[PDB]
């Protein structure tokens, strides 16, 4: 939670999100639903796939990792082989566990940053047309049909044609 | 006037790198921590020239071979050099006991005074 979006100012997740990660909930007049944000979730899934596959493939493959056996007169050799195997295992355990933990944290704040960047993206597209509330939600001042969603998720939300309507709704009396 | 603009440096460079979130991504400047070049020849290490055994084994000069007596009788070296599977090694056939230990010991010498007991 470095960027403080997930578990920050977006208190809880959504159980109905099944198609994508960083979706929406457009409680507009024409209907509702949990349409995902295809660009952001596709890029995020791509990124995590690169991360995991890099973790797998970079590990080189060799045909043996087996400690050999020794009789009762090569206790030096047996102890040395045990030291090599145990040191390799210790280094691998430390490195692998610190990795797993560290890029677990990187994955968490990367999802945090994706939700963040999405939030500031929508906020910049809307500027002051739609007021902000808690939980990362929004409140469009103007009348808002489904074409809003088309423009919002394609990034082509043209501010000026809805500007004056919001200006009227700022006070409304 | 007006219109200041924050930005970032782009250029005509075509270097590409690999990240843990993306592969083959184009950058502006980079650096190759890997080394994939060499002089292709043999020269001095730590300031001292390495030994040269032209077509001679370590036993070939340690045990002075008639074919290997043309060696450069220097005094110190940083590492010895052997041709891969040299032909004129031990002229008389046999087994060199603890040969590998001797080779590991004779790898470096700071003063090599050829005496006779």
């Amino acid at each position: 939670g470095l960027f403080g979006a997930i578990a920050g100012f977006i208190e809880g997740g959504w159980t109905g999100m099944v198609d994508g990660w960083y979706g929406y909930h457009h409680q507009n007049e024409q209907g509702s639903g949990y349409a995902a944000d295809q660009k952001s979730t596709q890029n995020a899934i791509n990124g995590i796939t690169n991360k995991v596959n890099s973790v797998i493939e970079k590990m080189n493959t060799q045909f043996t990792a087996v400690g050999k056996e020794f009789n009762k007169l090569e206790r030096r050799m047996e102890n040395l082989n045990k030291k090599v195997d145990d040191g390799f295992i210790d280094i691998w355990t430390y490195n692998a566990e610190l990795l797993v933990l560290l890029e677990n944290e990187r994955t968490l704040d990367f999802h945090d940053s994706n939700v963040k960047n999405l939030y500031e993206k929508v906020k910049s597209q809307l500027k002051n047309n739609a007021k902000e509330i808690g939980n990362g939600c929004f409140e469009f001042y103007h009348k808002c049909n489904d074409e809003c969603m088309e423009s919002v998720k394609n990034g082509t939300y043209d501010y000026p044609k809805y500007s004056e309507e919001s200006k009227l709704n700022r006070e409304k009396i | 006037g007006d219109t200041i603009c924050i930005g970032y440096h782009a250029n005509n460079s075509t270097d590409t790198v690999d990240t843990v979130l993306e592969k083959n991504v184009t950058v502006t400047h980079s650096v190759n921590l890997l080394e994939d070049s060499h002089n292709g020849k043999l020269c001095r290490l730590k300031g001292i020239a390495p030994l040269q055994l032209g077509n001679c084994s370590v036993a070939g000069w340690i045990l002075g071979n008639p074919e290997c007596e043309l060696l450069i009788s220097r005094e110190s070296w940083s590492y010895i050099v052997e041709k891969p599977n040299p032909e004129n090694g031990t002229c008389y056939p046999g087994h060199f006991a603890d040969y590998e230990e001797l080779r590991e010991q004779l790898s470096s010498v700071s003063s090599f005074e050829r005496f006779e007991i």
Partner: antibody, heavy 121, light 107 residues
């Protein structure tokens, strides 16, 4: 460049199950896609899973009849279709979802080679 | 859910000509298109992914383009080793629908 080695060629009676493998060469977590090449018809994507979500998505005309499972342990995708019928005679192609720009999702990247699955008498 | 209507259905040409394959989509799929050539009796393989990028190990004569509901694939010139049917895929939303197939044959 993951050398996908799919299963062999097999035939079965109508109204049964099928098992077509997509054994890869190296451990990979990119998505999996399966496509039907019926003779004379074009390609159409049937089903597929994403090892990130873990959910198994399917075509809206195929769900239930077809299931896809790919254990992350071996990264080998399995192909099951229940209640086989004759017009499903085709050759099956498996995609590993990996282009030059890393493992990207929404593309096909490298492809399989083909498994002849003909349903007849 | 979204149908990939290939256009034109099928034409013929010769070596070194100008041909355009248009993929039409009902709903806007942004720029998550593909372009697969399918040799008869061979494994299919893509040319352009995300409607602009070029797959590695592919001649530069293929250049995709377009976004939204109108796309394109502009071949610079035709050689005797790239005559086949062509498909366009959408991946903006599931399900993933392929195309009809535009064949090119010796004139």
């Amino acid at each position: 460049e993951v050398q996908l080695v799919q299963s062999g060629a097999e035939v079965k009676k109508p109204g049964s199950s099928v098992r077509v493998s997509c054994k890869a060469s190296g451990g990979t977590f990119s998505a999996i896609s399966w496509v039907r090449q019926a003779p004379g018809q074009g390609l159409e994507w049937m089903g597929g899973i994403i090892p990130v979500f873990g959910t198994a998505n399917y075509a809206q005309k195929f769900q239930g009849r077809v299931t896809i499972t790919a254990d992350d342990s071996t990264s080998t995708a399995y192909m099951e279709v229940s209640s086989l019928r004759s017009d499903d005679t085709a050759v099956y192609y498996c995609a590993r979802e990996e282009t030059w720009k890393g493992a990207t999702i929404g593309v096909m990247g490298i492809w399989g080679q083909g498994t002849m699955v003909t349903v007849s008498s | 859910d979204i149908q990939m209507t290939q256009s034109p259905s099928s034409l013929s040409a010769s070596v070194g000509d100008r041909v355009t394959i248009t993929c039409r989509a009902s709903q806007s799929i942004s720029s998550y298109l593909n372009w697969y050539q399918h040799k008869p009796g061979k494994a299919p393989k893509l040319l352009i992914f995300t409607a602009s990028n070029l797959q590695s190990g592919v001649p530069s004569r293929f250049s995709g383009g377009g976004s939204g509901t109108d796309f394109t694939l502009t071949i610079s010139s035709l050689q005797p080793e790239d005559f086949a049917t062509y498909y366009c895929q959408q991946s903006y939303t599931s399900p993933r629908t392929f195309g009809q197939g535009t064949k090119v044959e010796i004139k």
